[PDB]
C-alpha cells in the first residue's frame, strides 16, 4: 500500500591505445 | 666499396570500449 | 493485488582497430 | 656493380561491435 | 485474473573489414 | 648486365552482419 | 675504412579509464 | 507512512601514460 | 491470484580468424 | 649472366558465427 | 658475383566473443 | 499483497589476440 | 668480399575482458 | 506495509597484455 | 676485416583491473 | 513505524605492470 521508486544507472568507458615506431640506418663506405 | 641499409617499422593499435546499463524499478498500488 | 512496472535497458559498444605499416630499402653500389 | 631492393607492407584492421537489449515488465489487476 | 505485458528487443550489429597492400621493386645494372 | 623486378599485391575484404530480435507478449482477462 | 651505425627506437603508451555509477532509491506511502 | 530518499553516486577516473625513447649512434673511421 | 513463470535467454558466439603468409626469393649470377 | 626470382603468397580466412535464443513461459493457478 | 634476397612475413589474428543473458520472472500469491 | 521473484543475469566474454612475424635475409657476393 | 643482413621482428598481443551482472528483486507481504 | 528485497551486483574483469621482440644481425666481410 | 652488430629489444606490459559492487535494499513494517 | 535496511559495498582493484629490456652488442675486427 505504498509507492517506491528505484533508479540505477551504470556507465563505463575504457580507451587504451599504443604506438611503436622503430627504424635502422646503416651506411658503410 | 660501399653498402647502405635503411629499414623502418611503425606499428600502432587503439582499443576503446564503452558500456552502459540502466535499470528503473517502480512499485505502487 | 498491486501495480508494478519494471524497465531495464542494457547497451554495449566495442570498437577495436589496428594499423601496422613497415617498409625496407637497401641500396648497394 | 650495384643493386637496390625496396619493399613496403601496410595492414590495417577495424572491428566494431554494438549490442543493445531492452526489458520491460508491467503487472496489474 | 491479472493483466501483464512484456516487451523486449535485442539488436546486434557487427562490421569487420581488413585491407592489406604490399609491393616491392628491384633494379640491377 | 642489368635487370628489373616489380611485384605488387593488394587485397581488401569487408564483412558485416546485422541481427535484430523482438519478443513481446501480453496476457489479460 | 669507416663504419657508422645509427638506430632509433621510440615507444609510447597511454591508458585512461573512467567509471561512473549513479544510484537513487526512494520510498514513501 | 513516511517518506524516505537515498541518493548515491560513484565516479572514478584513472589516467596513466608512459613514453620511452632511446637511440644509438656509432661512428668509426 | 495466479502463478506465472517466464524464462528467456540469448546466447551468441562469434569466431573469426585469418592467416596470411607471403614470401619471395631472388638469385642473381 | 643469369638470375631467378620466385614469389609465393598464401592467405586464408575463416569466419564463423553461432546464435541461440531460448524463451519459455508457463502460467497456472 | 652473386646476390640473394629472401623475405618472410606471417600474420595471424584470432578473435572470439561470447555473450549470455538469463532472465527469470515469477509472479504468484 | 503478492509474491514476485525476478532474476536477471548478464555475462559477456571477449577474447582477441593477434600475432605478426616477419623476417628478411640478404646475401651479397 | 661478402655481406649478410638478418633481421627478426615478433610482436604479440592478448586482450581478455569479462563482464557479469546480478539482479534479484523480490516483493511480498 | 509490505516486504521487498532487491539485490544488485556488478563484476568486471579486463586483462590486456602485449609483447614486442625484435632483433637485427648484420655481418660484413 | 670484419664487423658484427647484434641488438636486442624486448618490452612487455600487463594490465589487470577488477571492479566489484554490491547493493541490497530491504523495507518492511 | 516500519523497518528498512540498506547495504552497499564498492570494491575496485587495479594492477598494471610493465617490463622493458634492451641491449646492444657490436664487435669490429
UniProtKB/Swiss-Prot annotation, chains A, B, C, D, E, F, G, H, I, J, K, L, M, N, O, P:
<feature type="modified residue" description="Phosphoserine">
    <location>
        <position position="2"/>
    </location>
</feature>
<protein>
    <recommendedName>
        <fullName>Glucagon</fullName>
    </recommendedName>
</protein>
<comment type="function">
    <text>Plays a key role in glucose metabolism and homeostasis. Regulates blood glucose by increasing gluconeogenesis and decreasing glycolysis. A counterregulatory hormone of insulin, raises plasma glucose levels in response to insulin-induced hypoglycemia. Plays an important role in initiating and maintaining hyperglycemic conditions in diabetes.</text>
</comment>
Amino acid at each position: 500500500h505504498s509507492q517506491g521508486t528505484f533508479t540505477s544507472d551504470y556507465s563505463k568507458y575504457l580507451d587504451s591505445r599504443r604506438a611503436q615506431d622503430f627504424v635502422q640506418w646503416l651506411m658503410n663506405t
